[PDB]
Amino acid sequence: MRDIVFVSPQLYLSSQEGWKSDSAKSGFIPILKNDLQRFQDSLKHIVDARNS
Amino acid sequence: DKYTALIHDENFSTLTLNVSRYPKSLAYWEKLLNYIVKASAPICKSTEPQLLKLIRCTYSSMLNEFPYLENYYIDFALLEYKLGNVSMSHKIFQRGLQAFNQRSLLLWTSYLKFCNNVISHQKQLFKKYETAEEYVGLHFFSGEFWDLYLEQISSRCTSSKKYWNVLRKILEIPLHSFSKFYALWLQRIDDIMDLKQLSQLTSKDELLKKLKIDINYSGRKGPYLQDAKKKLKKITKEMYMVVQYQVLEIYSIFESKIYINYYTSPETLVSSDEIETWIKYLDYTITLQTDSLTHLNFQRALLPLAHYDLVWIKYSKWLINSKNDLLGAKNVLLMGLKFSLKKTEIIKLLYSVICKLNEYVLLRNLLEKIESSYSDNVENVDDFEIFWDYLQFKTFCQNSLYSSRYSDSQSNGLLNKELFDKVWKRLSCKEKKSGQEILLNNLVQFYSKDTVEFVEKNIFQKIIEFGWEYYLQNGMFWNCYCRLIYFDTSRSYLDKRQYIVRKIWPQIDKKFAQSVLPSLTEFCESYFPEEMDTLEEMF
Amino acid sequence: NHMSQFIYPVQQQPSLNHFTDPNNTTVFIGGLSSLVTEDELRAYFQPFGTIVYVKIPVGKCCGFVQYVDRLSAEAAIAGMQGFPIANSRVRLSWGRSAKQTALLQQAMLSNSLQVQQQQPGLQQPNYGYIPSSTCEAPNVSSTMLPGCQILNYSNGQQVIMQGSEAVVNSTNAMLNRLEQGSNGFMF
Amino acid sequence: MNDILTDYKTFYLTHSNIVTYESSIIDSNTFDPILYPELKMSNPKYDPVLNTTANVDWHKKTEWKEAGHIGITTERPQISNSIIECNSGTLIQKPISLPNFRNLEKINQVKINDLYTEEFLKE
Amino acid sequence: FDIWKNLDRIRSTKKNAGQFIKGSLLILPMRTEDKQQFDECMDELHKYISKDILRCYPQKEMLFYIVLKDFNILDSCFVLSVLLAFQKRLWMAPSEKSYFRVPKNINLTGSFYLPKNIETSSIVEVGFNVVPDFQQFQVKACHVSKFMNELSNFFSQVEFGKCEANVINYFKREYNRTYSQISLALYELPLIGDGLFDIKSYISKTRPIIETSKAQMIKHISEMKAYNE
């Protein structure tokens, strides 16, 4: 699509591959392309708990 | 255009980003959808494909988080209906019915209503109702389902032998509204006006045997048919005595109390009594031994408390011991592992079902999928039970996969570099990991020459040498260190009484001997009465 | 067109005895060995739920037990019917508490009225409590989510169960009981 | 009884291997040291009994009689040859046989062995 | 307990077991940790079944789909007894390594799938199945002699057909998806507390009512204490 991207937090907080895909995949949530950084910033603390 | 004007709007960016931050909350999924429909308010074939494809992936991604939302499968078909592709409307009832495992009432009711209008083929449209009733026909509130099916026989079919055939079934089922179906039977029986029309009720033989009325009775029929009705109406009334007992039981005991029959969410909480009746209403339904009616009444009771595990356990327990189908019980927990939020009581049981079934390659793969969840640090978990259920089942495989490295064919159990390092890393936490001594008490269990010398040196000596404070003040530790030595089959009584009393007893500190003594006395008071004085003088 | 097709069914009450009270919890245990303490009897009926125990009368060969959930009681009746305690088959059924017994035994000699009083209601709906569940031993700031057991009953104080700390304290007392039980201290 | 079965499970999973296990399920009886203790946990008189005559003797047991209400051994009426298991697609072949009842007289007869009164209040 | 004597035994006493069933399709999913171990065994097993009747479809992300179609009853008795004995060998007798002679005191178990559209003891159909358009069955036979007899009495009764051309490609899209969901379910496990719930709004909504539901239990004990004493 244009100006939209499909992301799922369950594959990202567990740090797995394919946590974003631009095609309409199943179980993913459509967020704006510009807001992928504002997506990643919010989950940083939980990724710090997963890391450490 | 209308699409791009919605992306550059502020409220879209905040409502989306909220959902990706807090997935399972639902009330943000609901606002993301309730807003995005109103922003495309004229939703006809007109509106642009970028706006429709986006409103299709909201729904289809939202039902992939909450598969038990009956209304949003209906509401997503009707949007695909109005937009005008009934191919894609069927496909998403099929995906809705399969979500509930074919046995939900609202879907099959609000599928068939729709399905009347678009099937336009006789034999196949009744095949939808035949397939429907074997799943959701005995549902206690199914009254309104049959009223559709009887509406579609009368309306459509010519013969009027199916209408009597179907209605003979509904008379034997304990529905909520059964009296609306006896009223329809009694409006027919009265309107029967010839003796040939009693053949459509029941066979020519069973009339003459069970009631003694004959259709070939040629004579003056008027009073004879007026007798036949009175004789035939009676055994309806005896059936109305049978069913009414079964209904008024189930209503007065169970169904009266259950105030909530729908899903809501993972944040909804059910009352305590409501759980209490669902647990009893399920045991009652097992007693009846009606398998269609049992599967349905678990599924019917599942969706209000689908998150607890309390019903996922029983529904697997029913299937495992009563119906004797263990492979089928494995599938329930796997389907239950997803919805429940405890996930621990299931996963303990679910390991055990796989073990009995002899599918070990699955379970070894499953243990890899739970260590990979924490990133190879199950050892470091806060909730002990996930670790301890992991560990004892992880142990059982590595006894089997690797051959033993000790004497007397003892499977080198908890003592292996792979597992013991996970345990030693667990012991090192000391104060925070919170499942210490229970892990420690199972290290005692070896009872042989080689393994006692191992666990002495590799844990019970190194715990003294590093000299952590927490473990030496807890008398449960010293008690376990004594019981490791005493039950060894290698030692005689002399050295076993020496090695403990001469070396182990003095290694404790005199300050710790306040709080250690109670648990350490209990070992002494039971196994060593002879040397109970030499304990007391030391402290 | 005066009368109607259908009415809601009206029905008579069954007079409220101890056997037909739907709130009742207390299980009567008849035909004991009378070679059995209360603390050994408590070890038969602990696992079925939480107990608010009432008594075992002296030398009568028949005591009685009382849970807090009704569901827990019916799991105990169907659990241990014709189950031998110290070589004597045990017959058990519904029966009243100690105070209501005295109100019966004053009436049975004087055959006056015998008017029962039902157990008090819990006043529904309590969202925390899951029925037929035990806090196995005694800071908690839980998530209060539906999967976990939020509230519970202590052996009479309403405690908040910690899901992690429950299984470690139940398995704590499990291994403690095997070493005391083997050497005759607990029974 | 829980205390052995919880502990023996942990002990069997720890010290035994699959080859030890696989030879111990002879399968005349459905008994398995992993799965049996979880099933036999709070149930004392649990018996793994597979039989076809358990289907034949049903409807005359105390579980069936004291079904929704425990203690009270009522005699529930029922239709002998119930049609409700069969599907409407398969009934249309031959006409349906009339309903044979049983136990139809005892709709109101509810019996209770008041075991509390006659053995405690009466001695 | 040797296969070729047991297969000749089922050739004689099965009453015409040579003919193949029209529109027949049997899918056995399995997973093996050792690829090099299995790959020789299937290669040994591809020696007799002729590549049209049986096919091995690997799904890589080990898991193999063993599809079996257009088969003779006597052919289907052969392949399952080879495969199910191989799957259990890795744990029991790893030193044996003789593909067709089954080691003694090994009870065969496993599960095979069939199309839902089939017209109908050791082999049993299941209740509550996962893959939508299919129906799986469970084997639990003790001996290898008895396993042939139940299987050759199963396929006499069942008679089925009209399966679509690429049904196998529908099974992979389902059977991968139903374990794609469980792997994602275990990854949710450590992060239930605020990884994805919004607990702060949730705590603000339940704390008022659990404070009352606590007060209805402490009120209840005293109200229960008055009853007993």
Add this chain to the structure above:
Amino acid sequence: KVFVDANRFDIGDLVKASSRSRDETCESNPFPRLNNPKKLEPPKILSQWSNTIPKTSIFYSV
């Protein structure tokens, strides 16, 4: 969105020509049982055969 039927998709445009709106979410009324809900109305019965009913209930209702 399904039972109000002024505001479905299939029928919804037709009924507006000839309140309980579509905006409703699960924020309002979080816990249904808060003295709000009504018990389920009991199953109806035939007048003619109103005296086939068992006379007494099994348990004592309030």
